[PDB]
Amino acid sequence: EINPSQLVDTFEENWSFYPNAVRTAGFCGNPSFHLYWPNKKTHNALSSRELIIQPGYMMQFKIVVGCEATSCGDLHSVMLEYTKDARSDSWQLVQTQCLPSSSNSIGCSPFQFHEATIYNAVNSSSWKRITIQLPDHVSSSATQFRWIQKEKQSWAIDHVYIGEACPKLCSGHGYCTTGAVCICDESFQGDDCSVFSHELPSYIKDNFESARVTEANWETIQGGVIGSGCGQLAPYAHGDSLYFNGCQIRQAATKPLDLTRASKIMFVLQIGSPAQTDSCNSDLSGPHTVDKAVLLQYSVNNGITWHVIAQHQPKDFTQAQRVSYNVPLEARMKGVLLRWWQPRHNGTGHDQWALDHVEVVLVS
Ligand SMILES: *[C@@H]1O[C@H](CO)[C@@H](O[C@@H]2O[C@H](CO)[C@@H](O[C@@H]3O[C@H](CO[C@H]4O[C@H](CO)[C@@H](O)[C@H](O[C@H]5O[C@H](CO)[C@@H](O)[C@H](O)[C@@H]5O)[C@@H]4O)[C@@H](O)[C@H](O[C@H]4O[C@H](CO)[C@@H](O)[C@H](O)[C@@H]4O)[C@@H]3O)[C@H](O)[C@H]2NC(C)=O)[C@H](O)[C@H]1NC(C)=O
Ligand SMILES: *[C@@H]1O[C@H](CO)[C@@H](O[C@@H]2O[C@H](CO)[C@@H](O[C@@H]3O[C@H](CO[C@H]4O[C@H](CO)[C@@H](O)[C@H](O)[C@@H]4O)[C@@H](O)[C@H](O)[C@@H]3O)[C@H](O)[C@H]2NC(C)=O)[C@H](O)[C@H]1NC(C)=O
Ligand SMILES: [Ca+2]
Ligand SMILES: [Ca+2]
């Protein structure tokens, strides 16, 4: 007598309206059946049925926006929204931006900084799997979600799951299926898919003096290259730094590490320059200075949630400094990710930063 409480579709009555959508396969590296919107007179979108949803539900899907495109273009954002009565066209984003500058609103928790649920060619140029512990304001007796792109960019969706949160959201190494059970990815096991079958590195060392060691050490490096834009990083460091001048997302996130024996995280950081050069500058007058800080974060779920170890405001790092932090107990586990990230910035030529002497002591 009530609407369904789950929706699983790897690709009939699950989906309400899907303008311009086409059910195909083999787009941009996905061999499975998925639905695609081509680049080819309406807002193309994909909506769902009305769903009863309760606090503690999750949403997980696979998405592409612009296959193999250069990121610096704003292009056409795919927004993931929710609604509670379709008759009134009251649609709101599933997750809103939660930055250090923003107040703690409905979506935003104190220090759990995340992004919004809009997806662009910058982010999903490759098939990415997004997992969200959806906020409690989404829950209702008949909630509908939709992906809308309000001359267009292609985009695609596959393996959608909306329903009860299964243990630990499958730990970011597995997918949730019918009945709130977790089917793990390759080489991961357990009821929550947290246990890695193989072993992981004990500690990471990187002075960025050889491109091969850095290519082995890091999983994602976005918006920055091995260079010397802010100069030789410090009195504390030398040579080529990881220097972030690139447009859009500026990020350096390690491969999975084993931090059970990790003691402290040390590095040398600079944000801007005393010279305030075009290669390396910082806006200390703007009110959004907190968003232009370099956040050090850790993740135990392979990227679903990041927790702050330290924040580095640009006012305190005009001259590069060496810093050391204790690895929190919650982060002293197997399969931990470390990340250096700039939340906001003004594109190339603005708000640059450099990183060097990445050292995990991991020793008595
Ligand atoms: C980096 O990137 C950011 C974003 O693009 C730049 O920030 C922009 O700076 C310019 C100034 O160079 C701002 O223009 C001014 O806007 C005010 C009115 O602002 C009000 O209304 C805006 C929408 O209409 C709104 O965005 C504003 O809110 C911003 O600022 C408040 C705090 O002030 C903050 O709470 C918000 O979150 C936003 O950050 C605000 O509500 C206007 O009065 C100004 O006009 C004067 O100056 C111009 C010439 O400069 C002149 O022609 C006018 O007659 C008048 O004298 C001016 O237009 C712009 O709003 C900013 N945008 C954002 C999104 O913040 C930043 O400058 C870039 N560079 C650097 C180095 O940081
Ligand atoms: C990559 O993925 C990101 C998320 O994973 C995508 O992020 C979103 O990108 C769009 C731009 O394409 C941004 O949209 C703008 O955001 C501002 C902020 O809204 C403010 O409004 C109220 C005013 O009352 C204020 O209180 C809020 O705190 C906000 O500050 C909007 O006003 C604009 O209309 C516009 O929507 C998103 O902000 C941004 N999300 C995040 C988390 O930053 C992103 O698009 C993808 N691609 C790229 C290139 O980054
Ligand atoms: Ca599929
Ligand atoms: Ca170096």
Curated annotation (Swiss-Prot):
Subcellular location per the Swiss-Prot or TrEMBL entry: Secreted, Extracellular space, Extracellular matrix
Domain EGF-like: 162-194
BNR repeats: 81-93, 297-308
Tissue specificity remark: The major isoform 1 is neuron-specific. It is abundantly produced during brain ontogenesis by the Cajal-Retzius cells and other pioneer neurons located in the telencephalic marginal zone and by granule cells of the external granular layer of the cerebellum. Expression is located in deeper layers in the developing hippocampus and olfactory bulb, low levels of expression are also detected in the immature striatum. At early developmental stages, expressed also in hypothalamic differentiation fields, tectum and spinal cord.
Disulfide bridge partners, by residue number: 98-108, 166-176, 170-182, 184-193, 230-280
Domain of life: Eukaryota
Post-translational modification: N-glycosylated and to a lesser extent also O-glycosylated.
Sugar-bearing residue positions: 14, 123, 346
Domain notes: The basic C-terminal region is essential for secretion.
Family indicated by similarity: Belongs to the reelin family.
Pathology linked to this chain's protein: Defects in Reln are the cause of the autosomal recessive reeler (rl) phenotype which is characterized by impaired motor coordination, tremors and ataxia. Neurons in affected mice fail to reach their correct locations in the developing brain, disrupting the organization of the cerebellar and cerebral cortices and other laminated regions.
Function description: Extracellular matrix serine protease secreted by pioneer neurons that plays a role in layering of neurons in the cerebral cortex and cerebellum by coordinating cell positioning during neurodevelopment. Regulates microtubule function in neurons and neuronal migration. Binding to the extracellular domains of lipoprotein receptors VLDLR and LRP8/APOER2 induces tyrosine phosphorylation of DAB1 and modulation of TAU phosphorylation. Affects migration of sympathetic preganglionic neurons in the spinal cord, where it seems to act as a barrier to neuronal migration.
Subunit structure comment from the entry: Oligomer of disulfide-linked homodimers.
Protein name in UniProt: Reelin
Species assigned in the record: Mus musculus (Mouse)
Gene name in the database record: Reln
